């Protein structure tokens, strides 16, 4: 029986992808309403409630996680008791912006100019050895700053410590590469994906990344291989980069299945969810070859009219079962066509059904 820290939609989808393989699941989440509960055994409890933690761990074959901000303490507490994939280290690295950048910077992968900022002297200490405008964000929320003074004003009423200074980067687009490494050591890579954000929320994902170079792919995969092996990664790893020209600058890493990959459920030969499961289980990884072209559109804080989205062919609706609320991810729609024209035509139909969707 697989145990999953986090009862969100990512966990809900891991379970749905696992039942066909005859697997079992148990989730842990502090909210009785976790949508994964509608699909498997859900244990309600705080991650730092040792009692709930150990109760949930009983009989488990292994433990993995879907909630990216899960307390690393809860993951390490169970690490001794049962197998845990990905390794707790990955959470550590991914949960601290500075620790994240240094790690990749140390692997030899490009990253925006960044500098640690704990004191006003640090802010200046690197405010120029970085640039301007730029971003100042908590290492563990964030604020873009243009004015040389708006910066020293930024740290104020933001914390004043434990922050990171990143040099704003004018990117052509944002892309991400979902990669996977089995318990056996085998690896696999999905086509790059173009992600579009708006209001600080992923709104649309285009796969494969439109135009993506053939060398661009190998480039991303290369960086990904380095990261996974460096961490003894097992499962699915999501790497987000900024694309400037033909360069890739590491932006963020998530030790788990990622939103920018939901299109793999029908748009790839093997979903990221099934592969994550195959990986942590020590089974042969499945093919990541794409099935035509996909457009992943998130459903944020609103419930589109089902009959209307289902009228579009190639459109695959996914409602998470969560209660609708402002800015909340309540589902997504994957449009899988076999020609960019058709794809672009269906996307037109769906854009009229979803708000705040930045597409033309």
Ligand X SMILES: Nc1ncnc2c1ncn2[C@@H]1O[C@H](COP(=O)(O)O)[C@@H](O)[C@H]1O
Question: Is 151 among the residues that bind ligand X (CB under 6 A)?
Answer: no
Q: Which stretch binds Cl ion (CB under 5 A): 91-99, 154-162, 176-184, 322-330?
A: 322-330
Is 229 assigned to a binding site?
no
Applying CB under 8 A, among 129, 291, 341, 352 the residue interacting with a second copy is 291
Binding partner of residue 284 among Cl ion, ligand X, a second copy, none, CB cut-off 5 to 8 Å per kind: a second copy
Applying CB under 6 A, among 91, 135, 268, 281 the residue interacting with ligand X is 135
Applying CB under 8 A, among 102, 226, 321, 359 the residue interacting with a second copy is 321
Burial 105-114 (b: 16+ CB within 10 A, else e): eebebebbbb
Q: Please give the residue whose beta carbon sits closest to ligand X in the complex.
A: 197
Interface positions, 175-214, toward a second copy (CB under 8 A): none
Applying CB under 6 A, among 22, 32, 51, 200 the residue interacting with ligand X is 200
What does the block give as tokens for 323?
Answer: 């209660």
Question: Is 358 among the residues that bind a second copy (CB under 8 A)?
Answer: no
Q: How far is CA 58 from the centre of its chain?
A: 28
Is 168 assigned to a binding site?
yes
Is 197 assigned to a binding site?
yes
Long-range pairs, 116-125, Cβ under 8 A, ≥24:
116/164, 116/165, 117/155, 117/163, 117/164, 117/165, 118/161, 118/162, 118/163, 119/160, 119/161, 120/152, 120/155, 123/151, 123/152, 123/155, 123/165, 124/152
Question: Is 326 among the residues that bind a second copy (CB under 8 A)?
Answer: no
Distances (CA, A) of 15 to 118, 218, 262, 273: 42, 31, 14, 8
What does the block give as tokens for 51?
Answer: 């009692």
102 vs 142, beta carbon nearer ligand X: 142
DSSP letter string over 302-336?
Answer: ----HHHHHTSTTEEEEE--PPP-TT-EEEEEEEE
Binding partner of residue 112 among Cl ion, a second copy, ligand X, none, CB cut-off 5 to 8 Å per kind: ligand X
Interface positions, 254-283, toward Cl ion (CB under 5 A): 265, 271, 273
Query: In this structure, what DSSP letter does residue 109 have?
Result: -
Question: Is 283 among the residues that bind a second copy (CB under 8 A)?
Answer: yes
Return residues touching Cl ion (CB under 5 A).
8, 17, 34-35, 265, 271, 273, 322
Return residues touching ligand X (CB under 6 A).
112, 135, 142, 166, 168-169, 174, 197, 200, 251-252
């Amino acid at each position: 029986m697989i145990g999953i820290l986090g009862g969100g939609q990512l966990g809900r989808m891991l379970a749905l992808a696992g039942y066909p393989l005859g697997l079992s699941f148990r989730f842990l989440d502090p909210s009785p309403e976790a949508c994964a509960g509608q699909v498997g055994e859900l244990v309600v409890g705080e991650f730092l409630d040792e009692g709930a933690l150990l109760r949930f761990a009983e009989g488990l074959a292994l433990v993995t996680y879907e909630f990216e901000n899960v307390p690393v303490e809860a993951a390490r507490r169970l690490e001794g008791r049962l197998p845990l994939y990905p390794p707790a280290k990955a959470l550590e690295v991914a949960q601290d912006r500075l620790r994240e950048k240094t790690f990749f910077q140390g692997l030899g992968v490009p990253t925006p100019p960044f500098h640690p900022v704990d004191g006003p002297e640090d802010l200046e200490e690197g405010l120029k050895r970085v640039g301007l405008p730029a971003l100042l964000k908590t290492r563990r929320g964030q604020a873009l700053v243009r004015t040389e003074e708006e910066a020293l004003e930024a740290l104020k009423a933001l914390g004043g410590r434990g922050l990171i200074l990143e040099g704003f980067v004018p990117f052509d687009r944002e892309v991400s590469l979902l990669a996977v490494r089995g318990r056996t050591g085998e690896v696999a890579f999905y086509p790059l994906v173009e992600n579009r954000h708006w209001g600080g929320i992923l709104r649309l994902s285009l796969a494969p990344a439109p135009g993506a170079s053939e060398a661009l792919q190998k480039k991303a995969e290369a960086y990904a291989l380095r990261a996974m092996e460096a961490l003894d990664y097992v499962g699915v790893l999501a790497l987000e980069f900024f694309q400037v020209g033909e360069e890739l600058l590491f932006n963020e890493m998530a030790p788990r299945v990622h939103n920018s990959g939901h299109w793999t459920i029908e748009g790839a030969e093997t979903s990221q969810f099934e592969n994550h499961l195959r990986a942590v289980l020590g089974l042969p990884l499945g093919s990541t070859a794409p099935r035509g072209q996909s457009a992943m559109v998130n459903l944020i804080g609103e419930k589109p009219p089902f009959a209307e989205v289902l009228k579009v062919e190639g459109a695959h609706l996914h409602w998470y079962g969560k209660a609708v609320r402002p800015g909340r991810k309540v589902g997504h729609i994957t449009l899988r066509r076999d020609g960019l024209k058709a794809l672009e035509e269906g996307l037109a139909r769906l854009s009229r059904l979803v708000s705040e969707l930045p597409w033309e």
